[PDB]
Amino acid sequence: KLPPRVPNLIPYVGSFVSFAKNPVQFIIDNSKKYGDVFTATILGKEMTFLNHPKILDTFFKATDNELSLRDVYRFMRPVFGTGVVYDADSTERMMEQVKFVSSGLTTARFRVFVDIFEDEIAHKVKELGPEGTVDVAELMADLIIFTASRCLLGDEVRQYLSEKNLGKLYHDIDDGISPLSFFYPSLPAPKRDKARKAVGEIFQELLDKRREEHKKHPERLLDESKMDVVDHLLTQKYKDGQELTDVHRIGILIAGLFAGQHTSSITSSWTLMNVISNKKVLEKVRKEQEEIMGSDKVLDYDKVMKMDYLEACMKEALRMYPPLIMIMRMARKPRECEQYIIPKGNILVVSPSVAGRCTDTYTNPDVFDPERLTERKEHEKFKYGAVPFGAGRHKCIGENFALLQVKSIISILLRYFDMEYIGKIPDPSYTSLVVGPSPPTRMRYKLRK
Ligand code: HEM
Ligand SMILES: CC(=O)N1CCN(c2ccc(OC[C@H]3CO[C@](Cn4ccnc4)(c4ccc(Cl)cc4Cl)O3)cc2)CC1
Ligand SMILES: [Ca+2]
């Protein structure tokens, strides 16, 4: 029958307070006591957590009529939009919409992205000057506002960032979503809604500016290097023949940009922080960069694809500090799990944060040691030993773009700057929807040329 239970402190609320204090420790602490599969009530919700790589297969291999994502991620509706992604009428429709994004993430676009990255950092060093100190998380966020927007939407968006305060609107949207929004989706957030409508109107004009741009220059549609997500959204249909609405298009763009930004700036912060405050790691990374760059002065894609150790550094940081700390599904029918029979209506939960520290998989898991991956292969010990991008049917489709964005920015900054971090490396703050480092995150920098 049912699994072991974390015991209600209180009716209805259940264990929400300890869970709230630190959701990762909550799961680890209840693991050590009640075992790899336990149910805890949290603000109304029968939440059943799966805590070991070895039980995960049925979680990742199920169908969406068995384990639903849309039942648990629909709360994102007032960020994304009605009828968009996890609010689509069907999983079939969500999947098509996820593919309109993916279709701007091609090898030919990726070559152009490295250029965009070079260009936005060029502009950013003018602000930073010959030396100074800067907040790591803020810098990465601010760069990726400009780089993600141009990569997915094309160059036209930039003037909205530069002159119509678009970056401020994103923030207003971003702040209006909360871990709590999962438990209470209908919470008022009039600031968020105002901005969401603001961005809605700006992207509608962006669609409209493009639609005549297509008429004036239809060679664009033949140029694989210039085709972005906006292009694909205007020119594709659903498979069954139906037209997209401009409402759906806007929504998909916003959702895509949200995915394009937070996970990446966070991961890029934790990666860069750990790299620059470890002499050995920094040395290996600089060495690789010297080797790949040779006598060229700027990046290209092919270079980025050779940056294997820098990629292991990033992946080490995802093990330790995964930005999505919990992956979840609603059980639309009872689900069997080992001895147990997880009941209908329960929310199955899997944590990449918890996986990253599991002593079965990783020696000395509190050390940033990328050679645990490149030499010891500790991730391979299980199929789901490492799931920072998920796995199976809904595995992240941004993975390659994220690897590209974060490797490029870091390589570029390392080209420009000597950098040192100030103080000990912080803990994750479990304040936000997407978990990043407890501020502040300061470093000094000095130009090298
Ligand atoms: C370090 C960076 C990133 C991390 C850690 C990450 C993590 C994840 C994870 C864990 C999932 C699985 C969610 C689930 O199964 O419930 C996922 C799905 C997804 N990610 Fe990412 N992601 C990253 C970057 C991106 C980027 C850059 C994009 C798009 C530009 C993106 C788009 C998506 C999409 C569209 C899905 C949908 C998969 C589905 O529900 O079918 N992600 N991501
Ligand atoms: C209370 C608490 O402490 N809690 C921690 C945070 N808990 C949580 C909330 C949401 C969540 O959602 C992950 C799912 C849904 O959202 C994304 C996030 N995402 C970003 C990049 N890749 C995926 C996504 C996918 C595709 C697209 Cl188009 C856009 C996006 Cl935003 O995947 C995962 C976990 C809620 C509970
Ligand atoms: Ca887990």
Cα of 238 vs centre of ligand 3, distance in Å, is 36
**Residue 233 and residue 97: Cα distance in Å, rounded?**
9
Cα of 167 vs centre of ligand 1, distance in Å, is 22
Cα of 389 vs centre of ligand 1, distance in Å, is 6
Asked if 105 and 278 count as a contact pair (C-beta separation under 8 A), the reply is no
Q: Which of 321, 328, 291 lies closest to 308 in space, CA to CA?
A: 291
Residue 323 CB–ligand 2 contact under 6 Å: no
Which protein residue's CA is at the shortest distance from atom 15 of ligand 1?
394
Which protein residue's CA is at the shortest distance from atom 36 of ligand 2?
179
Test site for ligand 1: of 396, 404, 405, 433, most ligand atoms within 8 A of the Cβ: 396
Asked if 390 and 399 count as a contact pair (C-beta separation under 8 A), the reply is no
Measured from the alpha carbon of residue 43, the closest ligand is 2
The two tokens of residue 167 are 């970056």
Cα of 349 vs centre of ligand 3, distance in Å, is 7
Could you list which residues have their CB under 5 Å from ion ligand 3?
51, 350-351, 354
| Structure-solving method | X-ray
Residue 19 CB–ligand 2 contact under 6 Å: no
Cα of 328 vs centre of ligand 1, distance in Å, is 13
**Residue 247 and residue 85: Cα distance in Å, rounded?**
12
**Which atom of ligand 1 has the smallest separation from the CA of 390?**
10
Query: Which residues are CB-neighbours of 397 under 8 A, at least 6 positions away?
Result: 98, 101, 102, 105
Which protein residue's CA is at the shortest distance from atom 12 of ligand 1?
390
Q: How many CB atoms lie within 10 A of CB 52?
A: 19
Q: Strands 335-337, 417-421: parallel, antiparallel or unpaired by DSSP?
A: unpaired
Cα of 52 vs centre of ligand 3, distance in Å, is 5
Cα of 351 vs centre of ligand 3, distance in Å, is 4
Cα of 324 vs centre of ligand 2, distance in Å, is 6
This structure's resolution (Å) is: 1.9
Q: Number of C-alpha atoms within 13 angstroms, CB side, residue 399?
A: 12
**Which atom of ligand 1 has the smallest separation from the CA of 402?**
27
Q: For 1-449, which CATH class?
A: mainly alpha
Q: Strands 347-350, 45-50: parallel, antiparallel or unpaired by DSSP?
A: parallel
**Which atom of ligand 2 has the smallest separation from the CA of 433?**
6
Residues within 6 Å of ligand 1 by CB: 69, 98, 101, 256, 259-260, 263-264, 267, 323-324, 327, 388-390, 394, 396-398, 401-402
Test site for ligand 2: of 24, 97, 327, 433, most ligand atoms within 8 A of the Cβ: 433
Which protein residue's CA is at the shortest distance from atom 21 of ligand 2?
259
**Residue 123 and residue 136: Cα distance in Å, rounded?**
17
Distances (CA, A) of 211 to 105, 204, 326: 21, 11, 40
**Residue 347 and residue 334: Cα distance in Å, rounded?**
11
**Residue 394 and residue 59: Cα distance in Å, rounded?**
11
Residue 148 CB–ligand 2 contact under 6 Å: no
**Which atom of ligand 2 has the smallest separation from the CA of 85?**
28
Which protein residue's CA is at the shortest distance from atom 25 of ligand 2?
259
Q: Which of 414, 421, 416, 419 lies closest to 448 in space, CA to CA?
A: 416
